[PDB]
Design a protein around this ligand. Structure first.
Ligand SMILES: *[C@@H]1O[C@H](CO)[C@@H](O)[C@H](O)[C@H]1NC(C)=O
Ligand SMILES: *[C@@H]1O[C@H](CO)[C@@H](O)[C@H](O)[C@H]1NC(C)=O
Ligand SMILES: *[C@@H]1O[C@H](CO)[C@@H](O)[C@H](O)[C@H]1NC(C)=O
Ligand SMILES: *[C@@H]1O[C@H](CO)[C@@H](O)[C@H](O)[C@H]1NC(C)=O
Ligand SMILES: *[C@@H]1O[C@H](CO)[C@@H](O)[C@H](O)[C@H]1NC(C)=O
Ligand SMILES: *[C@@H]1O[C@H](CO)[C@@H](O)[C@H](O)[C@H]1NC(C)=O
Ligand SMILES: *[C@@H]1O[C@H](CO)[C@@H](O)[C@H](O)[C@H]1NC(C)=O
Ligand SMILES: *[C@@H]1O[C@H](CO)[C@@H](O)[C@H](O)[C@H]1NC(C)=O
Ligand SMILES: Clc1ccc([C@H]2C[C@@H]3CC[C@H]2N3)cn1
Ligand SMILES: Clc1ccc([C@H]2C[C@@H]3CC[C@H]2N3)cn1
Ligand SMILES: Clc1ccc([C@H]2C[C@@H]3CC[C@H]2N3)cn1
Ligand SMILES: Clc1ccc([C@H]2C[C@@H]3CC[C@H]2N3)cn1
Ligand SMILES: Clc1ccc([C@H]2C[C@@H]3CC[C@H]2N3)cn1
Lengths: 203, 204, 204, 202, 204
């Protein structure tokens, strides 16, 4: 008993299908928690970054009658088992290295939360990393195949308290804003949240 | 959704190992390379590390549907492992290709597939004059690995250069893209290949 | 002893994605870290390369059997991909964990699972005073990643230090291990965590 | 018109070497040297990039050209059929295959597999700076199938693929197949060995 | 040949996760290491990069057949993923093992299996005196990870040293191989292990 819910939640479920529903796009809440700026290649213009990626959305195919399943309040599912935002780091110059277990938490109302810790390298102008002005990196994320009307990317207060106390670099400033733009190819507009970080070398 | 019984259909009698050529008609795939950055240049070993968007599109007749039978379904985002994809290859690459974006293609209700993966790969290139005013010239040659002219028709299309990183140790002196058809030792037929030629020099 | 129709049974109605709880009964997993070596210390980027032996054990009620019905079968060696395993995570790790040993767990006839993977992983750590007599102190924090206190109860147990390599550029000034319960920004609940604190200094 | 794939993979086990009574499967092997990436003089290794040209005949893979109209050949994933389990006896790194792992199959069952590969080999690169140059022996051969199961035959090695620029110039190249017995393994195992002699330009 | 309806049979009621033991009869596996090369030595981190042939053989009673019912079939080349294989582990390795050859073992008509992987792996080792005449001594310890003495009996056998590379920055001062049995902190039973000890020094 108890987890005959997994048998159910994955019965007629195709993880390749964005769980939208007539007119209304699936809205995914995105937020980036900067944890550390590992390195800066001044010669090739890249930053090695470690961060928490906070994503949540609602999959209507994934809800259940809390009755029929007694104590089951939430379930920990493998992201390979359900649909997940196909977010992409636009300016990344390296495959993303996901450091935590690829599990997602699912609510009895179908609310999903996937919170992977990641290390990835981005293309960035790290010129003034030694000036008082510092260097500014723009970490741009957004769905890769779903446009505004299919997947609505919404941001939400970026956390900065995870930032490592020691660390060769100090955070001069941080901002996060979502945008919508058209691309050479692809007819529709694409929403994207961009985490902008300004940092300088301590001392 | 509610109407994605379309995926169940699109993959029913579908073998992704089968090039969708419809009799006496080679599948024509449109190819274009958007140079984003020239990461490094190994002058000692003659290689360039390059990052680029790869724009490919073609038509899979097995993948079309009656827009009626499936109400609001205009297009679908499918895993490239689920359908046939051009077996393009970097003839002069000296490293496996590292695909940076989600491996998904967009499929039209008329069977038009689009696949734009961002890739980082190293190529064999004579980077001698990367410091001269002439600059170094790298030829990134791509082409279908096992399908010849009559099976897969590689067509190019205006290469985009606006994606190029503004900062970056290197500046783009020149860029050209042209498709060709050749004969190779072995393989009876001729194979088409689009070659992106880039000339760049170190700024300052 | 042949009669391994037990594996057929142990994996019949078994979903490894399901944490083996039982109403108001969290699965308690015993965790312990045996430090084997401190490979390197990046003073520039603040990281430590560490090789350790994680000792984990817990009870999966779905995995017990009547020792009668299966004669000589005392225990079984199963692939961790075949059963539920604590989704422990290195909270301060800056690299994917590289597991060096076969990913097999041992299972008791009473459902007691043992899993002791040897691992090499890099952690974020202030390795400033690695040359001072005080030494540097690294905190290796582990904890479930998706299950809170009431679902998975992380319990520690005497950390072993005898595995530490005799030679090695570094000597162990001190070691402590303690479990805690904290709340995080997001996730409404408490997630227990055992933290292995190591203080080491460069020999000579 | 590809119900041929459905057929070609029906009662087909890619783990079974396509032999017949007292008839070893003969695979034609040839290496096209494309580039000598690097040379570690301290550890004695060469980084090499090359085209491997393999062909053989799989009798399970032929069809009546009639029953399948225009189908002259098919491009199949090597995971779908049997492929020589060749190994680089002296490689010190896993092989990195750079091209799509697809093979071409004839209507008569003739298979062709041409994978571009980058791999590192153990080699005495001492005299890479002398006029004599360094000589590397790239030895390949079936890993589990002996002479009577898999007959490795060589064939004129191509050298025109060699990169014009490149820190190194090709002083000499030879390719020869051999048969030997090893410590263990009762039977003799054949192997084609590509020997390259190169020196640093200038 | 062919008559490979033998593979269909050999894998019918076969679970590769089941050690082919049998009531008071541990499966005995013969292990031997052929040192081919000592790639590098990190004196700062105390590690050795090594390339070796691991020679393993054992008997799987589930894998035998009536040589009659299958005419010319003397032996078969099977993928190790298809049958049970000793879960040997390099107790003191600090890197995942990189297997360089095709992962196939050969199987006798009497059930005798032979796996012969070539491997490159890094081990924790005190490479202090690699420049002294005494040389450095590395102990490569292997052993089953989850099966104790009574389940899997590890037996050694004359280590081969003729595979050692003639050139190479290092020369072999000495080589010895011996199996042992111990009891460990945890795990009730005793576990057997073969340890390849190599002493080498820098040439010249
Ligand atoms: C489903 O929920 C309804 C109310 O929302 C409840 O009346 C019903 O009993 C539930 N299903 C069952 C029978 O478990
Ligand atoms: C479900 O998730 C949503 C997310 O906002 C939350 O509001 C709600 O309280 C959660 N509880 C359940 C079980 O629905
Ligand atoms: C499309 O589907 C409709 C179903 O009502 C029908 O007219 C017919 O089967 C199809 N015709 C096309 C291809 O437009
Ligand atoms: C255990 O299983 C056996 C069947 O082999 C059954 O007869 C017995 O009642 C069960 N309980 C005991 C006695 O352990
Ligand atoms: C396994 O069962 C034994 C009795 O057979 C019990 O005492 C022990 O606590 C259990 N767990 C282990 C393997 O320690
Ligand atoms: C080939 O096929 C034709 C008709 O499909 C048949 O009549 C003929 O006997 C076949 N020949 C072969 C290859 O045996
Ligand atoms: C093994 O082979 C013999 C061959 O005559 C056959 O009778 C039977 O399958 C096996 N032996 C017996 C008599 O059980
Ligand atoms: C096959 O049988 C022989 C005896 O004929 C025996 O030594 C061993 O089990 C097998 N030989 C091999 C492959 O070592
Ligand atoms: Cl298959 C495919 C089609 C289009 C795209 C483009 C749409 C968004 C914005 C740029 C890139 N991601 C990416 N992939
Ligand atoms: Cl899917 C998901 C939900 C919540 C979490 C959070 C809970 C624990 C503490 C921080 C992180 N791990 C991580 N992942
Ligand atoms: Cl299996 C196979 C057969 C032939 C080929 C050839 C087709 C393209 C052009 C030369 C080479 N690559 C590639 N692969
Ligand atoms: Cl499973 C197995 C058994 C034997 C062998 C050996 C036979 C040929 C020659 C050396 C190596 N390849 C390799 N693998
Ligand atoms: Cl699941 C499990 C049980 C026991 C062990 C230990 C027993 C042998 C000796 C150390 C390690 N291998 C490792 N894993």
């Amino acid at each position: 008993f108890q987890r005959k819910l997994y048998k159910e939640l994955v019965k007629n479920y195709n993880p390749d299908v964005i769980p939208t529903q007539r007119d209304r796009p699936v809205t995914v809440y995105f937020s980036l928690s900067l944890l550390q700026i590992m390195d800066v290649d001044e010669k090739n213009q890249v930053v090695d970054v470690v961060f928490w990626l906070q994503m949540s959305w609602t999959d209507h195919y994934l809800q259940w009658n809390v009755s029929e399943y007694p104590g089951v309040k939430q379930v920990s599912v493998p992201i390979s088992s359900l649909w997940v935002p196909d977010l992409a780091a636009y300016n990344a110059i390296s495959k993303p290295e996901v450091l935590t277990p690829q599990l997602a938490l699912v609510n009895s109302s179908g609310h999903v939360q996937y919170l992977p810790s990641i290390r990835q390298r981005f293309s960035c102008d790290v010129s003034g990393v030694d000036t008082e002005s510092g260097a500014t990196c723009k970490l741009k994320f957004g769905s890769w195949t779903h446009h505004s009307r299919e997947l609505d990317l919404q941001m939400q207060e970026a956390d900065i308290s995870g930032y490592i106390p020691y660390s060769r670099f100090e955070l001069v400033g941080v901002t996060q804003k979502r945008s919508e733009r058209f691309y050479e190819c692809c007819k529709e507009p694409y929403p994207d949240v961009t985490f902008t970080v300004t940092f300088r070398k301590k001392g």
